[PDB]
Amino acid sequence: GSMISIFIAEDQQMLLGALGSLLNLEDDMEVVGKGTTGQDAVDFVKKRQPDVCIMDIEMPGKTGLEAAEELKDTGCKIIILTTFARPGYFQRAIKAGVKGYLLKDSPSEELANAIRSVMNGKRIYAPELMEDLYSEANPLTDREKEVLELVADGKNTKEIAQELSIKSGTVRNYISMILEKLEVKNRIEAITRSKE
Amino acid sequence: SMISIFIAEDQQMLLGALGSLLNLEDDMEVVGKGTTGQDAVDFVKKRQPDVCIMDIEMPGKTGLEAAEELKDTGCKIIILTTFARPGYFQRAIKAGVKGYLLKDSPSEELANAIRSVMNGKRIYAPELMEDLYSEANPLTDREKEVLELVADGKNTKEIAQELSIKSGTVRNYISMILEKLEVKNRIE
Ligand code: BEF
Ligand code: BEF
Ligand SMILES: [Mg+2]
Ligand SMILES: [Mg+2]
Ligand code: NA
Ligand code: NA
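^ Those are the sequences you sent over. The predicted structure of the assembly is below.
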């Protein structure tokens, strides 16, 4: 009734179960359902309409971000809880209108407080995302700077994989991180320099 | 009596939630928590708990390097990891760990593994061997809907209309379907 009804979507069964127990122990909270894929979240949320959905990003079948996009206007308050502090993930979560974006490297004893704040109409982001992403500095790592150096010289995916002694899919994965990091840094710059 | 447990896990969310889960058991007490292998080495050497739930991948010092330094203490080391790598498994058992568990197993079967290890048993996740023969369909429900139309004899324009999605999305779904089936076919 007055309790905050929660659904948890998490593919790692150990964390899913431990989060469910932790949250259920709260007097004002009830874990009404648990799932391991984004489809489990879409199905539950559409059928049962819980107040809150604690959502992992990387899950099989359908991600937490695709699930957040499908549930954009349901009235369910989506709190992303992920290992990944990637700009593309955070940007995609903001566009889906998530109420919260939390990192798995934050105290467990604070999660219930984030749920209460989101129920109070607040938008809760891990300060670390802000501390790392909201910057005009170079976001690229030393490894990413080595990949891009070769790309800028005019070398193809096969040539970069040979020069760095790594797999062809790894070069493509590194390029995806670079494009994402620079696309967010470029959008941040563009918006803040146009507001002047 | 009570089984005293130390948990070494770099992901603060799991560390805290595992601690709370284990502490609910009547015969168990989480006496300490750490985020690196050094925290495990220091706690275990100073306090000598019965059991150490040990993550592998942690900054500074891994759970495997920690297990190697603790090899001659009376602590029962249980590896709890995301990684089902043979290299990790062999390194652990050579270090004398009593258990090697996977994080993708029911939380409700951790307490039982701790009790078995305290009873002198070696607990290794059956999944380590079973997941090799986990010959399952990699295609999603969405991918199964795309392929159903392709097999009927419908073109890219016809599939995009029947599913109400973009033409490039149909091509993206196909390129994914080919990749997943090519790897499943090579594994076969
Ligand atoms: F796999 Be979840 F994005 F941490
Ligand atoms: F980082 Be632990 F090996 F899951
Ligand atoms: Mg996940
Ligand atoms: Mg780890
Ligand atoms: Na409750
Ligand atoms: Na207890």
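The domain at 1-131 of chain A is CATH 3.40.50.2300 (Rossmann fold). Residues 132 and 183 of chain A are 15 Å apart (CA to CA).

Shout if you want it in another format.
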